[PDB]
């Protein structure tokens, strides 16, 4: 049923769970404090508005909650603000009593990385993927050591359509 906490996510039954040393351990449902962060940039200074971003926010937020994660949603941030927010998210004590995390980044994008709210071709405002990993690794985020860190990115990686032609 969709009225439950897992909503539209198909449930894994007890017989299915037993059928599945090579798996990441899952914490007790009663005591665990699962955390997830979504950063979505809709309104920008120079780059056109990202219409339909609210559908993506709603969708991902509901899904991550369905999988048992408490979801933090932050909107329209510069690359500096994202760095600050990611640093703040890494320091959250709930991670210690969590078995995993989910990071979601949604924005306009270029080859170098994800665009902040103030990005322009003259004055770039870019968050590199390399910076995300660095803030969430064992050195800067010891609480998520040995725990799966899933990063989801909705953005362009450049300008190319990504296609080539071939004949039959």
């Amino acid at each position: 049923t969709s009225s439950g906490s897992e909503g539209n996510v198909k449930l894994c039954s007890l017989e299915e769970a037993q059928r599945i040393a090579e798996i990441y351990p899952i914490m007790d449902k009663s005591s665990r404090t699962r955390l997830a962060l979504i950063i979505c940039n809709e309104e920008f200074d120079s780059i056109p508005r990202r219409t339909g971003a609210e559908v993506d926010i709603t969708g991902m937020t509901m899904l991550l909650q369905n999988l048992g994660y408490s979801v933090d949603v932050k909107k329209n941030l510069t690359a500096s603000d994202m760095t600050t927010e990611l640093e703040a998210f890494a320091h959250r004590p709930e991670h210690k009593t969590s078995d995993s995390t989910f990071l979601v980044f949604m924005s306009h994008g270029i080859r170098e990385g994800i665009c902040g709210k103030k990005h322009s071709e003259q004055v770039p405002d870019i968050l590199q993927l390399n910076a995300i990993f660095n803030m969430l690794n064992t050195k800067n985020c010891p609480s998520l050591k040995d725990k799966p860190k899933v990063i989801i990115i909705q953005a362009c990686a450049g300008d190319s359509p990504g296609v080539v032609w071939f004949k039959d």
């Binding site: 296609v163 080539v164 071939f166 039959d168």
Partner: peptide, 9 residues
Amino acid sequence: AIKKAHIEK
């Protein structure tokens, strides 16, 4: 006839 294909796959 020509068909589209992913550049990187």
